[PDB]
Amino acid sequence: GDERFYAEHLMPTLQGLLDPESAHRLAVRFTSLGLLPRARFQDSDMLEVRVLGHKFRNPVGIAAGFDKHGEAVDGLYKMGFGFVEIGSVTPKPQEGNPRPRVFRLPEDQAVINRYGFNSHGLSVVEHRLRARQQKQAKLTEDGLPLGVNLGKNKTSVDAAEDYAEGVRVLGPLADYLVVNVSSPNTAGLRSLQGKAELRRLLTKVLQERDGLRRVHRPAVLVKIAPDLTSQDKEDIASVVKELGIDGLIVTNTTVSRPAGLQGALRSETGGLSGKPLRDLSTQTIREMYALTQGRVPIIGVGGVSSGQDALEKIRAGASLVQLYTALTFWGPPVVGKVKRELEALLKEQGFGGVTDAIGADHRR
Ligand SMILES: Cc1cc2nc3c(=O)[nH]c(=O)nc-3n(C[C@H](O)[C@H](O)[C@H](O)COP(=O)(O)O)c2cc1C
Ligand SMILES: O=C(Nc1c(F)cc(-c2cccc(OC(F)(F)F)c2)cc1F)c1ccsc1C(=O)O
Ligand SMILES: O=C(O)c1cc(=O)[nH]c(=O)[nH]1
């Protein structure tokens, strides 16, 4: 599994033969079948992180959206990810938007997607996870946690109830749950990021979570957008502190279109991911870390494709990071690359380990 071979030949050829969504479906199939290049990199103690009531062998996870229905969890761990997050999952099954709904921006090392929460639904995912529940229990104990990202149905009349249902159904199977109120492709979803609605929504979510039996009680995190106003961020930080939310995932895709995008499909509707989002995400992490006084665990996501990208987010305040778009361009080998580069940079910058670097920029 040569990083250069996948980056220079395999992936480019694959993308030249298959459209984005087809490539993705194949990716999921191959991953679930274990058809992956050998993960040479061996995790060192330096990369181990303890947060959210769990141990993570390494801080690099697969972001939500790649394995929406929980079909390739084990294959993703085999890829080298320190933790896996599936979803978003909606209460009832739904098809999402018509195709095409995902677009590549090669010149920008970016992607634009408007899937619209295509989901097999809670019931299907529930049984799929139950079939490997004990196997996961051992993985988690082994330092390989599982996260479940919750969404809401398009025609739902009670947003809060949709999330409450997800907590009750998939909460017992997850190490952590994500209340995703930052999808740019669901009408009025990001509005749930407002203070009044957010507090009511999260109060209900936490009540349902607290009602679960001890060993089946997951940490609850909120995934936010990179397009929030300063006021929005202040409010989120306030509610997080008020309710005791366990953590934040920063960030989801952006509806902004940074000047400089070259892709012919730059004006397609949807959320932009990849390099163009990287620093916007890092800065959002930096601000949320400060607003929460570094007391709230943050999973950094957005444009991570190298060890430097990962370390910048960690130094900005992230305890863990995730990636997705980088995988679509460079393939499976990118996971080992990021981990190897991160370890080298940590040493090079005098950090005994990842934990020591969390929020380092704020202390200089
Ligand atoms: C094709 C695609 C589908 C996604 N689906 C979801 C989703 O269902 N739920 C979610 O919370 N984020 C979703 N995301 C967002 C990613 O989890 C992540 O927040 C974002 O893409 C930034 O990371 P990246 O630049 O490494 O891709 C999706 C992203 C892409 C590119
Ligand atoms: O999943 C996308 N890409 C991917 C991807 F992440 C991973 C991928 C794999 C997975 C496992 C083994 C591989 O090596 C092999 F077996 F093939 F040799 C290649 C193939 C892919 F095509 C997306 C998503 C949204 S858009 C898009 C894309 O533009 O390709
Ligand atoms: O499913 C989608 O369209 C979607 C959801 C989400 O949270 N983020 C994203 O980029 N796309």
Curated annotation (Swiss-Prot):
FMN binds at residues 64-68, 88, 149, 180, 223, 251, 274, 303, 324-325. One of its GO terms (biological process) is 'de novo' pyrimidine nucleobase biosynthetic process. Catalyzes the conversion of dihydroorotate to orotate with quinone as electron acceptor. Required for UMP biosynthesis via de novo pathway. NCBIfam families: PRK05286.1-2, PRK05286.2-5, pyrD_sub2. One of its GO terms (cellular component) is nucleoplasm. Pathway: Pyrimidine metabolism; UMP biosynthesis via de novo pathway; orotate from (S)-dihydroorotate (quinone route): step 1/1. The active site is at residue 183. The keyword Transport does not apply. The uncleaved transit peptide is required for mitochondrial targeting and proper membrane integration. Residues 1-364 are mitochondrial intermembrane. Its main location: mitochondrion. The identification of DHODH defects as the cause of postaxial acrofacial dysostosis (POADS) was obtained via exome sequencing, demonstrating that this method is a powerful tool for identifying genes underlying rare Mendelian disorders. Exome sequencing consists of targeted resequencing of all protein-coding subsequences, which requires around 5% as much sequencing as a whole human genome. The keyword Heme does not apply. It is a single-pass membrane protein. Its cofactor is FMN. It comes from the Eukaryota. It catalyses: (S)-dihydroorotate + a quinone = orotate + a quinol. This is Dihydroorotate dehydrogenase (quinone), mitochondrial. SUPFAM superfamilies: FMN-linked oxidoreductases. It comes from Homo sapiens (Human). GO terms for molecular function: dihydroorotase activity; dihydroorotate dehydrogenase (quinone) activity; dihydroorotate dehydrogenase activity. It is linked to Postaxial acrofacial dysostosis: An autosomal recessive syndrome characterized by severe micrognathia, cleft lip and/or palate, hypoplasia or aplasia of the posterior elements of the limbs, coloboma of the eyelids and supernumerary nipples.
